[PDB]
Amino acid sequence: TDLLNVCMDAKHHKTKPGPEDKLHDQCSPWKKNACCTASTSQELHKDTSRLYNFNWDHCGKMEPACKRHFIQDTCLYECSPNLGPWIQQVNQSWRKERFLDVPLCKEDCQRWWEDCHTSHTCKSNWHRGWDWTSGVNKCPAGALCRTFESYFPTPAALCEGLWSHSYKVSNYSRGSGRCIQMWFDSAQGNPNEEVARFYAAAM
Ligand SMILES: Nc1nc(=O)c2nc(CNc3ccc(C(=O)N[C@@H](CCC(=O)O)C(=O)O)cc3)cnc2[nH]1
Ligand SMILES: *[C@@H]1O[C@H](CO)[C@@H](O[C@@H]2O[C@H](CO)[C@@H](O)[C@H](O)[C@H]2NC(C)=O)[C@H](O)[C@H]1NC(C)=O
Ligand SMILES: [Cl-]
Ligand SMILES: [K+]
């Protein structure tokens, strides 16, 4: 149970999960229990936020249908109090902990990949390798802009590879209670609580 209802020790996270009534737009489904502040939830909706100075439009403008998924992902990363069982210590300059091999529901990965098909990028790992010397990430030497499909030939390649394995792709369905959903209605409770509960008891 020590892995339940926690916030990892990372760059913006709160020390502990709490109610956040004013979570902005896409993060609001987390408003009953979040690891992010309202300010953070607000900032992550912005192009090239002050959170990480990360530019989504690094190979031209990213399609809205695609960008929403990255915003959604950032909501989960910053707000989720239910990733306890996958938290690992990594000792990095901008975070002492992170999560790895979170069982992301296949349909979520599939939808993300499909909606991002018509967008563009220059790298398959977005955590390491950028040219930051202007202050925001720019394609490094040798990295050409291409379609998403080029750098991520399958859904799993994007979902698992883009954020250096924060996720593994689960063969479980949305609503199985056996995989983490990036996209959920939380009117009747956050569905990923049950997921974290289940995998914490697996030991
Ligand atoms: N699911 C998910 N998992 C994550 O870990 C995650 N992380 C971020 C934060 N993203 C980033 C990406 C790059 C850099 C960055 O400054 N990269 C540098 C190296 C940083 C270092 O010293 O470790 C670079 O090499 O370009 C920081 C934060 C956003 N969404 C996520 N979403
Ligand atoms: C992931 O789940 C799917 C079903 O949602 C599994 O599919 C079935 O697999 C068996 C063989 O193992 C087939 O007889 C069925 O035809 C499959 N169902 C359909 C309609 O596709 C799939 O095997 C699972 N993947 C893994 C690796 O366990
Ligand atoms: Cl839609
Ligand atoms: K969650």
UniProtKB/Swiss-Prot annotation:
Disulfide bonds listed in the record: C7-C35, C27-C75, C36-C79, C59-C145, C66-C116, C105-C179, C109-C159, C122-C139
One GO cellular component, as annotated: plasma membrane
Keywords annotated in UniProt: Cell membrane, Disulfide bond, Folate-binding, Glycoprotein, GPI-anchor, Lipoprotein, Membrane, Receptor, Secreted, Signal, Transport
Compartments where found: Cell membrane; Secreted
Reported induction: Up-regulated by retinoic acid.
Record-level GO BP terms: cell adhesion; folic acid transport; fusion of sperm to egg plasma membrane involved in single fertilization; inflammatory response; positive regulation of cell population proliferation; sperm-egg recognition
Binding-site residues for folate, renumbered to this chain: D73, Y77, W94, R95, K96, E97, R98, H127, R128, G129, W130, D131, W132, S166
Topology in the lipid bilayer: Lipid-anchor; GPI-anchor
Principal subcellular localisation of the protein: membrane
GO molecular function: folic acid binding; folic acid receptor activity; signaling receptor activity
Protein family: Belongs to the folate receptor family.
Name recorded for this polypeptide: Folate receptor beta
Gene: FOLR2
